[PDB]
Amino acid sequence: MDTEGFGELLQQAEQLAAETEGISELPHVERNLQEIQQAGER
Amino acid sequence: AQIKQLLQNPPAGVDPIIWEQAKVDNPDSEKLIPVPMVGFKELLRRLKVQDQMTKQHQTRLDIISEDISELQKNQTTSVAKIAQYKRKLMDLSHRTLQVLIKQEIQRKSGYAIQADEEQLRVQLDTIQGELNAPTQFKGRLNELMSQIRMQNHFGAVRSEERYYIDADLLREIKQHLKQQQEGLSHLISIIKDDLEDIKLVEH
Amino acid sequence: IQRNTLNIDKLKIETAQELKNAEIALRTQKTPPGLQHEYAAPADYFRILVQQFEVQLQQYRQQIEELENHLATQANNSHITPQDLSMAMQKIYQTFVALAAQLQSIHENVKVLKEQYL
Amino acid sequence: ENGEKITSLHREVEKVKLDQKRLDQELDFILSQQKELEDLLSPLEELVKEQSGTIYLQHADEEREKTYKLAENIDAQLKRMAQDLKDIIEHLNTSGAPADTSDPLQQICKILNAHMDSLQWIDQNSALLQRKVEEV
Known part of the structure; x- marks a missing residue:
């Protein structure tokens, strides 16, 4: 179907991890799967 | 009232006990009243209306769709202004600070200046060669950059292959994350309200 | 759009402090001009940015130290x-x-x- | 049954457009605060080259200025560094699966990490609040 939410989400999250000058908020590295599950557990 | 007005007193030549019962039988009375239907052409009738109806639904749905496209188009390439504004902000902050600073060297010596100043100055000293020196810089930044690249070289190949993969099956797991996203957004806004219902606990 | 609301609330909040450290700055030195004095601000705000930064440095080493634990991992x-x-x-x-x-x-x-x- | 949805579609759509409008004209105006607050940081370039000219017709020397010049570079320097650190992180992220970056896979890992991060907050901002309650 025609959805545009997670395309927002991914969007957001995309737009998230890249930069910038914002005095504080630096882009974050993305984990996933093996390290993440454990990361979730902690 | 007007409903009440037509539905009773009966219609087209429809029997009064049946017409009654469609009224009781009616599944959904505000949205609906009993309307007499008359054999096949009448169903034909209904269908003609349905189609009539269909086109207009489709269209209005298109109108919502166009307005949403306009909002998204405005929004998606409008990020530009927000980002631009933010950078301009930081540059103006630098100039603000630089002008703020020069108003404290030119009017201010005067050669008065000290007191509080040294404390500023103690903080600044600390932070500055902290940084320097030694330690940090060197070692760390580029064991990391020395390093990163070697991992880049190596990762490429191991790659090679493996062998496709599994991309593919990626569509959804689209979908299920959407639903986790809304749940988290509700919890975050509830925590934020919690502590509201909390500074007020400032009691 | 939603997301776009927090972004303006941030740009709002910020042009407001900068309008102003810009205002502790003009017209303070405007006086000067005639003859008055506005200034131990800075000392306020200068030491305020220091305090500001003081933590940002810690954030830098926090992230740095994560990176290598992360790379470290990447090696595994x-x-x-x-x-x-x-x-x-x-x-x-x-x-x-x-x-x-x-x-x-x-x-x-x-x-x-x-x-x-x- | 569909028509109803259509309704709260219309709804909530023109309240989205009440939205954007607004945020739209907002951005003008935050934008105008940026044209004014700028002309006039200078015309604050009078008031500051006057002081200069005046100060020059004085005995001489300038001093204890350097410290500030150091402060601004010092404050400035790390800003330099945050960029570099950003320039690294992106590279690290870049090093990661080939033949298709455009797939859904990475989509799900990004989004998901976004969720995990948000969840984290919710955690101890909550724990905060939960923490905080003790004084009471």
């Missing part, structure tokens, strides 16, 4: 998975659940205090 890093996605999501649907605990946890806690006040 190198091997198939549909089951795991599932295994992740059944875990997230637990993690969200204890977190909710806590939030109702807190929320009700606040509520209690709020009740006590009146």
Whole structure:
């Protein structure tokens, strides 16, 4: 179907991890799967 | 009232006990009243209306769709202004600070200046060669950059292959994350309200 | 759009402090001009940016030290998975659940205090 | 049954457009605060080259200025560094699966990490609040 939410989400999250000058908020590295599950557990 | 007005007193030549019962039988009375239907052409009738109806639904749905496209188009390439504004902000902050600073060297010596100043100055000293020196810089930044690249070289190949993969099956797991996203957004806004219902606990 | 609202609230808040450290700056030195004095601001705000930064440095080393734990990992890093996605999501649907605990946890806690006040 | 949805579609759509408008004209105006607050940081370039000219017709020397010049570079320097650190992180992220970046896979890992991060907050901002309650 025609959805545009997670395309927002991914969007957001995309737009998230890249930069910038914002005095504080630096882009974050993305984990996933093996390290993440454990990361979730902690 | 007007409903009440037509539905009773009966219609087209429809029997009064049946017409009654469609009224009781009616599944959904505000949205609906009993309307007499008359054999096949009448169903034909209904269908003609349905189609009539269909086109207009489709269209209005298109109108919502166009307005949403306009909002998204405005929004998606409008990020530009927000980002631009933010950078301009930081540059103006630098100039603000630089002008703020020069108003404290030119009017201010005067050669008065000290007191509080040294404390500023103690903080600044600390932070500055902290940084320097030694330690940090060197070692760390580029064991990391020395390093990163070697991992880049190596990762490429191991790659090679493996062998496709599994991309593919990626569509959804689209979908299920959407639903986790809304749940988290509700919890975050509830925590934020919690502590509201909390500074007020400032009691 | 939603997302776009927090962004302006940030640009709002910020042009406001900068209008102004810009205002502690003109017209202060405007006086000067005629003859007055505005300034030990800075000392305020200068030491304020210091304090500001002081933490940002810690953030830098926090992130740096994460990077290598991460790279470090990446080195271990190198091997198939549909089951795991599932295994992740059944875990997230637990993690969200204890977190909710806590939030109702807190929320009700606040509520209690709020009740006590009146 | 569909028509109803259509309704709260219309709804909530023109309240989205009440939205954007607004945020739209908002951005003008935050934008105008940026044209004014700028002309006039200078015309604050009078008031500051006057002081200069005046100060020059004085005995001489300038001093204890350097410290500030150091402060601004010092404050400035790390800003330099945050960029570099950003320039690294992106590279690290870049090093990661080939033949298709555009797939859904990475989509799900990004989004999901976004969720995990948000969840984290919710955690101890909550724990905060939960923490905080003790004084009471």
